[PDB]
Amino acid sequence: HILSDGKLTSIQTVANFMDALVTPPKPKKLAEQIEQSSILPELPNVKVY
Amino acid sequence: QPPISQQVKELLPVLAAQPGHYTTIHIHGKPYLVTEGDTVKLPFKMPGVAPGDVLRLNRASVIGSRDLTLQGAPYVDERLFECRAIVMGTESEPMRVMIKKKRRCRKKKHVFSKHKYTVLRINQLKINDVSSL
Amino acid sequence: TVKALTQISSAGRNGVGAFVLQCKKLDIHYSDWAGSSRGMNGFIKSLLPKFAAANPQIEFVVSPRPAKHPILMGHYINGRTKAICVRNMEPLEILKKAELLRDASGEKPQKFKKPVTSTNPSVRGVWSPYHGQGMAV
Amino acid sequence: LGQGGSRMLSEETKWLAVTHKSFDYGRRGYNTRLAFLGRQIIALETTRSILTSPVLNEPIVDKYGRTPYNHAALANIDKLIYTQPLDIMDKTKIARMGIDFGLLTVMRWKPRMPEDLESSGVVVVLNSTLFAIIGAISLEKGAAVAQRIVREKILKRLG
Amino acid sequence: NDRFPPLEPLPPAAESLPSPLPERALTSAKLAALHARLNLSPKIPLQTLARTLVDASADENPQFNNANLAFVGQTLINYHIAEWLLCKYPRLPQGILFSAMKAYAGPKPLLQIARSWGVDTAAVPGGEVDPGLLQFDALKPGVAITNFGYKRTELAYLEKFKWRRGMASRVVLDDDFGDVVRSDVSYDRYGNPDTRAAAERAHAYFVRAVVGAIYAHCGREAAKAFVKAHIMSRTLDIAKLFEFKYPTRELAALCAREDFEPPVARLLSETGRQSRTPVFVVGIYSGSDKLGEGAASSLDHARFKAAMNALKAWYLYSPGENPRVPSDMLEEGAKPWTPAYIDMGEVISR
Amino acid sequence: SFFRITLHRSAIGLPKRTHGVLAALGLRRRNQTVFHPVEPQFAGMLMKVKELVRVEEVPHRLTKRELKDERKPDAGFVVEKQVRRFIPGVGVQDEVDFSKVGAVVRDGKRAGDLGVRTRSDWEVIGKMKSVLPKVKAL
Ligand SMILES: [Mg+2]
């Protein structure tokens, strides 16, 4: 993982360092974002394509 | 509560025994002559109601059958009858444009009006037995 | 001799005995690229999950539709369809529009003419000049 | 109807149930309407005697190798695959019951050809009379009293 | 292809099955909405509601099909309406009774109850279709349910040679609506009057099945409430099922049977005689009592119409709008049963 | 006491000074009710518009929320049963029947917290293959 200087400067605590490394990029597609949601995938009457 | 008149207590069974009954309910002061099963389309959007909601109507000006008519002075006593409705959703009208204009003046002002209306369904209209009362 | 006719059936009155929400389906079309779908994307993540749980009798289908404005298309029991373009609307405006499709019926809009609609004959029958006290000119 | 049968119905009703539409050109009431309700009552009791009867059913092997849902509530409704109500409610079986209890010497009908009773509608005429007796008990005494008589005085005599 | 992956994950051996698998019903949004639309209790799983939507024309197997549920349901619907109709109008003529049973629990009204529930049909039955669609095969001619009525020995003659059937044997020999019993593929075609019947049949069997599932899972009392709410709530004008042949003669036989004095037609009012559209009001009077009244343009027609109104009043006599039903006794302890009125029968006259 | 003044007529064609008298009393539109203390200053104010208003002595002054509550018609209905709804700022309010009375609003970040039937609940109901209604009830 190559960390940017904008990140290293923003990092100030050990917890911030862990977040930058273990947090994968946020999904751009709303569909992949809905799969991670807890409510919508579980509802019986809702179907996401 | 005020006891019902003895004349209304002896003729109410004669009114409830006849085949059909109608009533004049009052929603916000406006009357609507209806019968069980009728569909009232109110000229306003009742706030805070969703389809499936049950409304109990308690302001009835007239309850009568073919030959007999029960009239309350301001309104009939709620203990005598039981009227209930159900909200069947809301409907709208086609947008209508009003053009306000004066002669020899090019400016035509437009007014767009598209109102919503709540629709009801009288699913219960029964006259109670007041022998106990 | 009485001969029974066999060409008349019973008519249903929704709301009497049982109620059936006229809205049976709701199509939610969004776009990840279109800028006009920014609010629709925020409605699907914050307000749709709970609104879809409050109406378990509606089939919600969320499908993408790039290169097109976002729309709410509600299918009704009578076979008709109502679509609403929600371009450039905020998430709370979409929830106000989805409540319009849920409370609405499949019928076409019509001007307000008469409040009551009854299919049951008059309790007091229609007037007749022959069933009263008469009239003298 | 067993002990107390005569008193359960009524003087007028008991005669009406046993009277067919072919007697006296219907000037005196007939049991046709009662026979309608009686059949509806009997059908719903023979359908319940197949659903609630404890029997070991052989499951069918689907050609496509599918597996059924196998719910305990649908196992009772899957009992109609082997025993159908009409197998129990046979015209000849129900008609034979009345002839055994002496219903042929009591009922009021006019056969078109008296000598050849069989070809004059004895089966159809006997079934309409046995349904009426059950259609009149229900209306006059309630379903609970009728449901006890269909399970004991009809179904228990037809296996 | 790679650009268009399948929307629904399914095995390769899924487009060949007659109907979707039971576990497929646990991932469809149409069933979950259909189950919540009818307010069915949670006792009925989704794997059971799916079976109600699979007609016996799409699946020959006794299980996975509507054959058994639709039977148990037809018996309940028919029984509950039969007892309610006899308690409400105890004097209905038998032919009219058959027409009124068919007007509530027949293929025609049951087709509208299914269309009021938002039930969309599948084009062609297959394992790929989602279980939330009513799936049947309308090109299969021989699909039918099992009925209690028997086949008539003279069935062929009745149709071909116009033999007489009768209305007293229909109760035993015929079905519950009086009708007689036993009365590759190319999709380049149009609808048929025979297919429309299969479409009506499939919808009716489904609505009957839903009642069969409610009875199996929720019990008897639940089924009666469902029938009372969705079927018996429909409105019908029974006065419009009447067709009279020589009503004046029939009315005379009525008064003679009940010992009422002979009926006499009297001209209550009239106007416009010797005009294009006169009005005559004649009232049929048995002694001093007035049985019925009718108004027509012709003097004879007014006398006929007045006789019909008197006969309709005799047959359409109702003790009450919401009468007690004999089925109310077998449930939890209720008030003792009171004998209901039993009419002799409709008058037979010349 | 107080003066209960109600503008019965208009002043569309009256002099401009008459509009200054109706502006000091507070009568903007027609049939508008105002309450002013009984005093010579107001009494001479009404002698200038006495052809347009209706005066009445009242014991106490009426508030803004009480002048409107005397022309308010009775609703004529009462909500006795409500169906499940989603309130944007509160949560998912369950069904309530006021005939047996319970507005319980469950909010959360999971479907289970909302109080609705989820897919897992439909799998638990589908595996209960032993549940059966009593023979007497069947
Ligand atoms: Mg001016």
Swiss-Prot record, chain B:
Family: Belongs to the bacterial ribosomal protein bL21 family.
Free-text function comment from the UniProt entry: Component of the mitochondrial ribosome (mitoribosome), a dedicated translation machinery responsible for the synthesis of mitochondrial genome-encoded proteins, including at least some of the essential transmembrane subunits of the mitochondrial respiratory chain. The mitoribosomes are attached to the mitochondrial inner membrane and translation products are cotranslationally integrated into the membrane.
Record's keyword terms, sorted: Mitochondrion
One Gene Ontology CC term in the entry: mitochondrial large ribosomal subunit
GO molecular function: structural constituent of ribosome
Protein name in the entry: Large ribosomal subunit protein bL21m
Quaternary data: Component of the mitochondrial large ribosomal subunit (mt-LSU). Mature N.crassa 74S mitochondrial ribosomes consist of a small (37S) and a large (54S) subunit. The 37S small subunit contains a 16S ribosomal RNA (16S mt-rRNA) and 32 different proteins. The 54S large subunit contains a 23S rRNA (23S mt-rRNA) and 42 different proteins.
Location of the protein in the cell: Mitochondrion
Main location: mitochondrion
Included stretch of the parent chain: 85 to 217 of 217
Organism of origin: Neurospora crassa (strain ATCC 24698 / 74-OR23-1A / CBS 708.71 / DSM 1257 / FGSC 987)
Curated annotation (Swiss-Prot), chain C:
Recorded GO MF terms: structural constituent of ribosome
Entry's Gene Ontology cellular component terms: mitochondrial large ribosomal subunit
GO aspect biological process, one term: mitochondrial translation
Coiled coil stretches, renumbered: none
Alphabetical keyword list: Mitochondrion, Ribonucleoprotein, Ribosomal protein
Entry's localization field: Mitochondrion
Domain of life the protein comes from: Eukaryota
Major place of residence: mitochondrion
Pfam families cross-referenced by the UniProt entry: L51_S25_CI-B8 (PF05047)
Family classification: Belongs to the mitochondrion-specific ribosomal protein mL43 family.
Record's function text: Component of the mitochondrial ribosome (mitoribosome), a dedicated translation machinery responsible for the synthesis of mitochondrial genome-encoded proteins, including at least some of the essential transmembrane subunits of the mitochondrial respiratory chain. The mitoribosomes are attached to the mitochondrial inner membrane and translation products are cotranslationally integrated into the membrane.
Subunit-structure text: Component of the mitochondrial large ribosomal subunit (mt-LSU). Mature N.crassa 74S mitochondrial ribosomes consist of a small (37S) and a large (54S) subunit. The 37S small subunit contains a 16S ribosomal RNA (16S mt-rRNA) and 32 different proteins. The 54S large subunit contains a 23S rRNA (23S mt-rRNA) and 42 different proteins.
Protein name according to UniProt: Large ribosomal subunit protein mL43
Originating organism: Neurospora crassa (strain ATCC 24698 / 74-OR23-1A / CBS 708.71 / DSM 1257 / FGSC 987)
Gene expressing this chain: mrpl51
Curated annotation (Swiss-Prot), chain D:
Localization per Swiss-Prot or TrEMBL: Mitochondrion
BP GO terms, sorted: mitochondrial translation; RNA processing
GO MF, one example: structural constituent of ribosome
Source superkingdom: Eukaryota
Main localization category: mitochondrion
Transmembrane parts of this sequence: none
Membership in a protein family: Belongs to the ribonuclease III family. Mitochondrion-specific ribosomal protein mL57 subfamily.
Known function: Component of the mitochondrial ribosome (mitoribosome), a dedicated translation machinery responsible for the synthesis of mitochondrial genome-encoded proteins, including at least some of the essential transmembrane subunits of the mitochondrial respiratory chain. The mitoribosomes are attached to the mitochondrial inner membrane and translation products are cotranslationally integrated into the membrane.
Subunit comment: Component of the mitochondrial large ribosomal subunit (mt-LSU). Mature N.crassa 74S mitochondrial ribosomes consist of a small (37S) and a large (54S) subunit. The 37S small subunit contains a 16S ribosomal RNA (16S mt-rRNA) and 32 different proteins. The 54S large subunit contains a 23S rRNA (23S mt-rRNA) and 42 different proteins. mL57 forms a heterodimer with mL44 and stabilizes rRNA expansion segments 1/2 at a membrane-facing protuberance close to the point of attachment of the ribosome to the translocon in the membrane.
Record protein name field: Large ribosomal subunit protein mL57
Gene giving rise to this polypeptide: mrpl15
UniProtKB/Swiss-Prot annotation, chain E:
The UniProt record lists the keyword Mitochondrion: yes
Domain of life: Eukaryota
Entry annotated with the keyword Ribonucleoprotein: yes
GO cellular component: mitochondrion; ribonucleoprotein complex; ribosome
GO molecular function, one term: structural constituent of ribosome
Keywords attached to this entry: Mitochondrion, Ribonucleoprotein, Ribosomal protein, RNA-binding
Biological processes annotated in GO: RNA processing
A Pfam family reported for this protein in Swiss-Prot or TrEMBL: dsrm
Cellular location(s): Mitochondrion
Disulphide-bonded residues: none
Family, as annotated: Belongs to the ribonuclease III family. Mitochondrion-specific ribosomal protein mL44 subfamily.
Binding partners and assembly: Component of the mitochondrial large ribosomal subunit (mt-LSU). Mature N.crassa 74S mitochondrial ribosomes consist of a small (37S) and a large (54S) subunit. The 37S small subunit contains a 16S ribosomal RNA (16S mt-rRNA) and 32 different proteins. The 54S large subunit contains a 23S rRNA (23S mt-rRNA) and 42 different proteins. mL44 forms a heterodimer with mL57 and stabilizes rRNA expansion segments 1/2 at a membrane-facing protuberance close to the point of attachment of the ribosome to the translocon in the membrane.
Protein known as: Large ribosomal subunit protein mL44
Organism: Neurospora crassa (strain ATCC 24698 / 74-OR23-1A / CBS 708.71 / DSM 1257 / FGSC 987)
